[PDB]
């Protein structure tokens with residue numbers, strides 16, 4: 041009926057505790073937000089199901 | 090059915106230290122990989138049932 | 139001195155089985171409660187280890203190849219297995235390494251050594267003093283050009299014993315990698331008569347020697363008028379490492395407790 | 402400014418509709434830096450390595466082991482006497498912030514056309530026949546004109562290269578061979594013969610030679626980093642060690658951010674670092690006092706903002722998810738956390754939920770229909 | 786191409802140190818004399 | 834080239850152009866007929882490959 | 883990249899040699915999330 | 931890359947220059963399989 045809800049902090053996965061990596065991740069624009077939107081879409085719908 | 094986490098109040102009390110090591114989830118949490126709780130507890134599912 | 143001790147019996151080349159031995163810590167990292175996958179020069183499981191003896195009659199000290207590294211183990215009593223020679227010519231045309239545990243200290247050295255055809259060490263057995271003492275060193279005639287030399291702080295290690303079965307197993311891994319001779323080792327108590335014990339136990343690293351030399355062959359050194367003698371009954375086994383992937387099960391506290399050879 | 406202004410930003414809208422919104426994970430920041438290095442007092446032998454009276458021949462290159470010493474690479478770096486100083490697995494500035502397990506100086510002399518062949522993955526009779534560096538060489542190549550030290554007017558033929566070899570030599574291999582190269586199909590025994598060559602040839606190094614034909618002294622520093630117990634280190638003083646506080650640690654060059662803690666992990670005497678399933682360090686043996694330290698990343702979690710929309714009110718409640726009300730108040734703005742906002746640290750309604758910690762919402766015993774879903778049986782709503 | 790604001794920075798150095806005029810460098814000219822911004826837009830021109 | 838019945842004087846050195854052909858020196862470097870063959874940018878073995 | 887550990891690039895290399903290595907790790911890890919979220923979006927349709 | 935044939939790279943370039951061209955082909959090829967397997971995982975749901 042459901043699966044485990046997950047949420048992934050896209051900056052902390054890629055660039056964990058690093059400011060330099062964080063300033064470089066900004067060069068890929070919305071990609072991390074798109075990932076968190078998609079996981080929030082899945083995770084809200086496990087409570088719908 | 091034997092689960093690996095469900096967002097059951099992680100509090101670095103058992104994670105930080107001996108239990109950061111042997112735990113898929115402690116490595117999950119520390120890297121932005123979080124598991125969220127369902128909206129309905131296993132008691133509320135049982136009341137509807 | 140330098141002498142050939144030719145009084146021995148001719149026997150064919152023996153072998154036995156490396157069941158689950160020759161596994162060592164592949165790095166200087168702590169791990170626990172984990173099954174870790176690594177590719178390195180390990181002893182292939184259940185390989186033919188080539189088998190050697192000292193008896194009464196037999197004093198098996200052949201000059202053996204050393205290719206991609208070596209596993210060496212001795213089931214031992216009365217401290218018979220005392221060291222090893224390594225090199226590619228052994229006749230002072232090129233350098234060679236000596237590792238020796240004498241009666242008092244360990245010596246480790248690299249030289250253009252001129253080795254004997256039969257290298258060994260010898261002990262005066264119960265000669266009116268009730269104790270036993272080392273007296274003969276006959277391994278090389280000279281050691282002119284040398285480039286690495288170490289001697290341990292002094293001790294006395296005993297050279298006596300006549301119990302039937304073996305009470306000690308001693309295991310060593312020798313890898314000569316990129317100018318470094320790496321030694322890994324284990325000791326365990328046993329109660330076995332004539333074969334390599336079935337079981338598992340991993341070898342901790344113990345010394346890393348920066349020796350820099352080519353090694354292509356090796357030979358072990360045994361304790362013993364010039365000809366006619368009694369050897370102590372002790373037995374040793376030799377295997378060759380290969381690039382094999384291993385899965386390593388670390389327990390709770392933090393030590394290898396089982397392994398799987400992926401090939 | 403405030404958690405609502407983070408959601409307005411996160412969504413790129415000045416109006417936020419009713420809901421529970423995901424926001425930046427909070428993370429408690431380091432109170433201070435720690436530095437810890439093995440205490441060695443003698444400075445490494447740079448005057449022996451870079452200033453010997455004679456160097457080796459390239460065919461028989463010397464290798465000196467540098468160990469149990471402090472390395473001040475600022476002396477080598479800042480000195481103008483060097484024409485080449487290139488590093489291949491470190492930037493040259495970082496050499497002083499860092500430690501090395503075993504370090505070596507490969508010392509020899511070559512022509513100024515050949516310095517290019519000393520770089521890893523190269524070809525020509527130096528890279529091919531007498532000094533090959535590995536594909537992953539970690540270290541620095543250091544080179545300078547020594548015409549005034551080495552060269553004599555008729556030719557310093559003491560410096561020898563190898564012109565012939567059966568095969569390209571392996572990385573860091575040295576070859577003392579003087580055995581005769583067979584260029585014809587014939588075998589060739591003894592000292593000499595027709596189309597038989599002595600494999601070595603000498604440089605006619607003279608001061609009247611053009612630049613490039615002069616003797617360049619080379620040192621190649623080789624070293625390996627961060628993988629085993631250090632024995633050579635840069636000119637950094639250790640700080641005191643602190644525990645149970647979040648800090649920017651650095652042990653042997655193992656820079657990081659974490660809470661340090663006394664560990665019960667029984668490291669065997671050869672071990673120094675402990676690695677997690679994720680291939681990051683999670684324990685360290687302190688190099689001055691040989692106790693094991695657990696390393697934990699400083700406390701962090703999801704933040705989510707629960708709002709009743711912008712059209713109604715601006716008031717919001719904040720869920721620190723998977724976090725107990727304790728780690729909240731620990732998150733005091735005194736220790737720098739990501740969120741520049743700390744206004745909610747007031748509480749007096751800091752409800753604890755299975756889902757986490759809820760700040761800014763009152764906990765009413767009465768049970769209503771779920772409005773904004775918080776998780777684990779809890780919901781929130783905006784009411785009188 | 787066209788340029789919004791333009792500045793010629795004019796000075797004399799030793800010929801070795803022309804390299805230290807590359808962006809992202811270090812050494813006594815690049816350290817405390819004439820440091821470039823790491824994302825420098827421009828051209829460096831030198832002659833004996 | 835190598836077997837001509839008369840060579841030029843050095844003050845009037847010849848210049849024979851060569852094309853549309855294969856350079857097998859196996860009757861050449863492999864023969865002791867020359868008291869000096871030296872190449873200066875290639876190994877004499879590599880001329881075939 | 884030279885290492886899997888982000889701090890062993892940033893404590894070894896500078897501001898301009900690191901950027902080459904850090905960006906291989908940003909590219910590889912970002913593609914690791916885009917793989918996981920694709921798997922999980924397809925998965926969520928099997929559960930739906 | 932300078933070619934689609936993996937051996938034409940290895941025949942014409944040294945280790946560090948071939949590793950650049952080969953990593954293009956690996957990055958490309960791998961992105962071909964991750965596209966194919968995504969199409970097949972979606973198409974397997976149409977068939978399921």
Ligand SMILES: *[C@@H]1O[C@H](CO)[C@@H](O[C@@H]2O[C@H](CO)[C@@H](O)[C@H](O)[C@H]2NC(C)=O)[C@H](O)[C@H]1NC(C)=O
Nearest residue numbers: 139140141142143144253254255256257276279
């Ligand atoms: C031990 O015996 C070997 C031969 O079995 C001796 O080796 C010979 O040494 C001489 C020079 O002294 C050489 O001319 C022979 O060619 C060698 N023979 C072999 C088969 O190698 C060796 O010298 C003897 N050593 C001692 C100490 O007597």
Ligand SMILES: *[C@@H]1O[C@H](CO)[C@@H](O[C@@H]2O[C@H](CO)[C@@H](O)[C@H](O)[C@H]2NC(C)=O)[C@H](O)[C@H]1NC(C)=O
Nearest residue numbers: 097098099100102724725726727728753754755
């Ligand atoms: C949040 O942490 C506190 C500790 O700070 C927990 O309180 C402990 O609870 C146990 C079990 O009832 C008691 O035996 C301890 O004495 C308590 N310690 C203190 C100092 O309060 C609390 O249970 C935790 N809450 C959750 C939801 O995990």
Ligand SMILES: *[C@@H]1O[C@H](CO)[C@@H](O)[C@H](O)[C@H]1NC(C)=O
Nearest residue numbers: 151152153154184185186187
């Ligand atoms: C080991 O030795 C025996 C002879 O005693 C031989 O038949 C066998 O094939 C060998 N085993 C392996 C695995 O090489």
Ligand SMILES: *[C@@H]1O[C@H](CO)[C@@H](O)[C@H](O)[C@H]1NC(C)=O
Nearest residue numbers: 238240241242243244245289
């Ligand atoms: C042990 O051997 C070494 C050389 O191998 C020698 O220097 C030393 O004197 C010996 N010790 C004894 C007690 O014989």
Ligand SMILES: *[C@@H]1O[C@H](CO)[C@@H](O)[C@H](O)[C@H]1NC(C)=O
Nearest residue numbers: 262264265266267268269271
């Ligand atoms: C007995 O021991 C002494 C030294 O303790 C030694 O000098 C002597 O030679 C020994 N006697 C015999 C017969 O070995």
Ligand SMILES: *[C@@H]1O[C@H](CO)[C@@H](O)[C@H](O)[C@H]1NC(C)=O
Nearest residue numbers: 230231250282283284285577
């Ligand atoms: C080794 O011995 C030979 C023969 O005497 C000598 O020519 C050479 O210089 C020696 N090498 C060293 C390093 O002493």
Ligand SMILES: *[C@@H]1O[C@H](CO)[C@@H](O)[C@H](O)[C@H]1NC(C)=O
Nearest residue numbers: 225226351352353354571574
């Ligand atoms: C050691 O010497 C032997 C004999 O010359 C040779 O075949 C072997 O390749 C050498 N080993 C190394 C690592 O060069």
Ligand SMILES: *[C@@H]1O[C@H](CO)[C@@H](O)[C@H](O)[C@H]1NC(C)=O
Nearest residue numbers: 389390391392393394395667
């Ligand atoms: C693990 O710890 C237990 C209890 O302290 C002990 O009995 C056992 O010997 C330990 N194992 C190892 C491999 O150290």
Ligand SMILES: *[C@@H]1O[C@H](CO)[C@@H](O)[C@H](O)[C@H]1NC(C)=O
Nearest residue numbers: 447448451452476477480482
């Ligand atoms: C070598 O020694 C001289 C002193 O004789 C000193 O002036 C020079 O700077 C030293 N060179 C290096 C590279 O340290």
Ligand SMILES: *[C@@H]1O[C@H](CO)[C@@H](O)[C@H](O)[C@H]1NC(C)=O
Nearest residue numbers: 438439440441688689690691
């Ligand atoms: C570091 O120095 C202290 C004294 O300053 C000493 O206790 C300690 O032994 C030293 N470190 C090591 C590894 O010996």
Ligand SMILES: *[C@@H]1O[C@H](CO)[C@@H](O)[C@H](O)[C@H]1NC(C)=O
Nearest residue numbers: 416709710711712713714715
């Ligand atoms: C809120 O929005 C509604 C329309 O949705 C409007 O009728 C009302 O006047 C607004 N109130 C305020 C305080 O903005």
Ligand SMILES: *[C@@H]1O[C@H](CO)[C@@H](O)[C@H](O)[C@H]1NC(C)=O
Nearest residue numbers: 750752763764765766767768
């Ligand atoms: C919730 O109910 C308990 C009795 O179970 C009562 O003591 C407490 O005061 C109530 N809380 C509120 C906020 O009314």
